[PDB]
Design a protein around this ligand. Structure first.
Ligand SMILES: [Cl-]
Ligand SMILES: [Cl-]
Lengths: 214, 214
């Protein structure tokens, strides 16, 4: 049997690869195909049987799809380490403090996506970012911050991406988090679902994190 | 005036963003456009005036293009930290030791590219890698190593990419390095060329590295 798992790349800096690695060692018989797939696109891919599991980073719902929320990652503002030493405290900023700053969004894809999500955080607060640029993928955006192209809001795990000379400052607003979720077809009764969820639990426990399931 | 700079993303984990940042602060008047462009594609882009500077990671020559070699990055084998504890010594491996291992190449693009370069290192030694898979971009490949998909040869600066649970082992063969080079049109006499080269020198000196120029 072949298990097709959709994922977004920003999740590769967190616990997901560990989870897949553990699943694989526990289930060596199963052939695993990892497939890069945007969060919205995972819905249709699941429906059409092109993937069996979808790991995504923003909330999208569908009646045919069960969304299993694993964890909420706090958002951070990535800045060049010498950018605004006084007005951007290391203890954190509110989104209201950064509307004047050149801001990098990601990815470049058909919307809705993480770029529209981040924009919505401002919109629901009645804030308007003054300059937005859409960048292909998160790692590029962080590279461009270091090169002097402004600021970029990222999930906590992106703090470890190896771009030099950055600081990652907490975003203080309540709604500023990215949910890590696992999507599956509602009428899929395969044993790989409880098996992968068991692996999620083992890895989270290893790291002293309680997942939002159980 | 607008300065168009081509780059490959793997260079964002090294000194390049610092260099661009310094250039920018020293030359605030100049508008800078950073453009993602493969190393071979930078040749034609320079010729057609679509970029003015091309930062690449493999050796490609053209009579109309001046190639300025800045630095040579040693290659490393990225492995899951528990993969072959005895046969892959942390002190280093020869390419001959890894031909049986599932190997991830990158990027997926029209050849020649870094994937064909890495393949050529084996070929010139009379070695044949048993299983090669081409992956879209370096960060994905490293994520897939962590998830259990095998091994991946990367430049030294990619050791800092934030994928968890990897080890990066020296490749011992003499030809196993990636040259960082700056490409320009031979008949381009703009002052941004000596200016960016001066910035390269300042940043390298900051890091106690002697560049291969001067
Ligand atoms: Cl992205
Ligand atoms: Cl790449």
């Amino acid at each position: 049997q072949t298990l097709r798992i959709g994922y977004v790349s920003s999740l590769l800096y967190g616990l997901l690869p560990e989870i897949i690695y553990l699943f694989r060692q526990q289930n060596p018989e199963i052939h695993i195909e990892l497939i890069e797939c945007g969060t919205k696109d995972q819905i249709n891919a699941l429906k059409q049987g092109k993937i069996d599991l979808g790991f995504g980073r923003l909330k999208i719902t569908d009646p045919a799809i069960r969304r299993i929320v694993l964890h909420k990652e706090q958002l951070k503002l990535a800045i060049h380490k010498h950018h605004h030493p006084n007005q951007f405290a290391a203890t954190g900023v509110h989104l209201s403090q950064i509307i004047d700053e050149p801001m990098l969004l990601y990815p470049v894809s058909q919307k809705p996506n993480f770029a529209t999500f981040i924009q919505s955080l401002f919109t629901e607060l009645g804030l308007v970012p003054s300059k937005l640029t859409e960048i292909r993928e998160i790692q590029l955006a962080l590279g461009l911050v270091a090169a002097g192209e402004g600021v970029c809001i990222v999930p906590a795990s992106a703090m470890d991406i190896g771009v030099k000379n950055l600081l990652y400052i907490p975003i203080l607003d309540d709604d500023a988090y990215s949910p890590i979720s696992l999507a599956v077809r509602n009428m899929d009764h395969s044993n790989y679902i409880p098996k992968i969820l068991a692996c999620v639990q083992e890895v989270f426990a290893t790291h002293h994190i309680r997942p939002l399931i159980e």
